[PDB]
């Protein structure tokens, strides 16, 4: 795919990212800059890079090839890495707050001996690197302020979404009463859809000089729906995915989360299955978690998900028919192929 | 003082800040916006406001009174609150990472039943509010990008400083060998001096149309030295200050910190006092902490600090003589009176 053939160059650009960001030497900060290097290497590397590559792929498809200079392609790869760094910031903090164990096939940063809650500041540093990179690479470009504002707004929206995620999942309480489809859709729009799907395409758009309100609004209409599916898939895989593939161990049941699975469970459960859920959800005991997973299987939730994926795929394609123009449909099609 | 007579209006502006920031209602995010309100009220209120008031005071002294519109004064009070919000973001995270107990006369946010590590996301939200406010109030102003860049750069510098703070104070280790005057001065320049002293005056400068490199450089020369003293004072008060006055309980000894006190101790200690330090520092036991405090008193560190405050005050005033022009000396004098 077009993600395949952009990958290698994009990934190789990381050493350049790290080089430029370690050159703040101010010899006095040398030890901190070395810590930053370590943090970047542990937390920005080892996933699929789909968000960052999305910026690069869309940039190649929206920019006139004659305008695809060496320099403007360096900027695209940099802006792609900015998206990956935003992801790394949110994931470092999220793993702490979700009490997670592994991520991307290694133990979570904060679980590393000698890191612990110092990881909070490491996460803030990852965030800071975004704006340092934008200044360094894009400061003289017409779209500079547009990109700054887009990244900050996307961060605010994600943080609002994380807020709702955490409010809906208070530790060691109950009501399943909070866990509604309406609540779920709002959580995921905010925590996932904006930064994972809107951000990378929007950033490429602005870089291509496409700054129009209506063009961004139509793009957003497709991309936010993609983002909802992606988070539903993430919730499904939390329980039913293979950790060798996902790279991480699920914590949604123990964490009392408004997962798509629990929302679907509740919609289907008999009064008696409800009581089993209520007695077993939101608790660390492996035995109780296993009971929840058994309920989910009794209700054929995996089959519900497979049906949903089909209906969602067809809906997203219908939206691309409606909303893609005047942008190349390929911009959306490539993305949808990556996620579905 | 001029801080006295700006205070009331500045503090009253907070309800307006909170009002404008809760009006994102998107009914769906209502619960998150209510959490944000709670976070703002707990974490942005109850200190002395000296950083935010500094923006307002310097704005009144650098801007032509004829240009001090109703609107431009609303912007100054807003930019002042932006500085206070930046402070709140850093303090929420710092209390978690320093395992602190109280702040500003109440228990730390993260220690509140039902908050815990969710406070990490609350802190990120406080950060986000800065840029939301700058957009809302300042977006059409010539200095808009200057203020965005200043706040981001100040955050990056503070985070670099926090990095060095934490690297120098590894939990449950030793060497006092790390604790040198050189290391100390670099920590505090970065973690304190930029955001506490340079930021608020710089922000007022940019708002006044003073964007010149040399003017900012000369201002920085005074303000960074003030910031070093302020952090030395903060370290002194951590142990020897009255909690009813400081609002918080000290943790520097237990936290193994490169405090000014330990650096001064080491410079003075006999080989035998060194061994007492090494045996007792960096540990939670009240008895061991008391032994450290006893060593500090044996070495007359409080008297060393009082002498230092005098020498520092005289040095800062000498710098204001050298470097203040063409800005009103009052801008620096008022600040120095507040801290000394
Ligand atoms: O931990 P992961 O499953 O990767 C998780 P969540 O914790 O939201 O499930 C972290 C995260 C953060 C923002 C948007 N989606 C996600 C997925
Ligand atoms: O906790 P406080 O004493 O308020 C502290 P530090 O933890 O650095 O001593 C927090 C903080 C953060 C940045 C600059 N100075 C300070 C003072
Ligand atoms: Mg998680
Ligand atoms: Mg999460
Ligand atoms: Mg998940
Ligand atoms: Mg502290
Ligand atoms: Mg600290
Ligand atoms: Mg302190």
Swiss-Prot record, chains A, B:
* Keyword Cell membrane on entry: no
Keyword terms of this UniProt record? Acetylation, Cholesterol biosynthesis, Cholesterol metabolism, Cytoplasm, Disease variant, Host-virus interaction, Hydroxylation, Isoprene biosynthesis, Lipid biosynthesis, Lipid metabolism, Magnesium, Metal-binding, Steroid biosynthesis, Steroid metabolism, Sterol biosynthesis, Sterol metabolism, Transferase
Residue(s) at site: Important for determining product chain length: 89-90
Q: In which pathway does it act?
A: Isoprenoid biosynthesis; farnesyl diphosphate biosynthesis; farnesyl diphosphate from geranyl diphosphate and isopentenyl diphosphate: step 1/1; Isoprenoid biosynthesis; geranyl diphosphate biosynthesis; geranyl diphosphate from dimethylallyl diphosphate and isopentenyl diphosphate: step 1/1
**Any one GO molecular function term:** RNA binding
E.C. number: 2.5.1.10, 2.5.1.1
Record: residues binding Mg(2+) 1: 94, 98
Q: Tell me the compartments it is located in.
A: Cytoplasm
What the record says about activity regulation is:
Inactivated by interferon-induced RSAD2. This inactivation may result of disruption of lipid rafts at the plasma membrane, and thus have an antiviral effect since many enveloped viruses need lipid rafts to bud efficiently out of the cell.
Catalytically driven reaction(s): isopentenyl diphosphate + dimethylallyl diphosphate = (2E)-geranyl diphosphate + diphosphate; isopentenyl diphosphate + (2E)-geranyl diphosphate = (2E,6E)-farnesyl diphosphate + diphosphate
Write out the residues that bind dimethylallyl diphosphate. Answer: 103, 191-192, 231, 248, 257
* Oligomer status and interactors: Homodimer. Interacts with RSAD2. (Microbial infection) Interacts with HTLV-1 protein p13(II).
Task: Indicate the disease this protein is implicated in.
Answer: Porokeratosis 9, multiple types: A form of porokeratosis, a disorder of faulty keratinization characterized by one or more atrophic patches surrounded by a distinctive hyperkeratotic ridgelike border called the cornoid lamella. The keratotic lesions can progress to overt cutaneous neoplasms, typically squamous cell carcinomas. Multiple clinical variants of porokeratosis are recognized, including porokeratosis of Mibelli, linear porokeratosis, disseminated superficial actinic porokeratosis, palmoplantar porokeratosis, and punctate porokeratosis.
Protein name stated in the entry: Farnesyl pyrophosphate synthase
**Source species, please?**
Homo sapiens (Human)
Gene name as annotated: FDPS
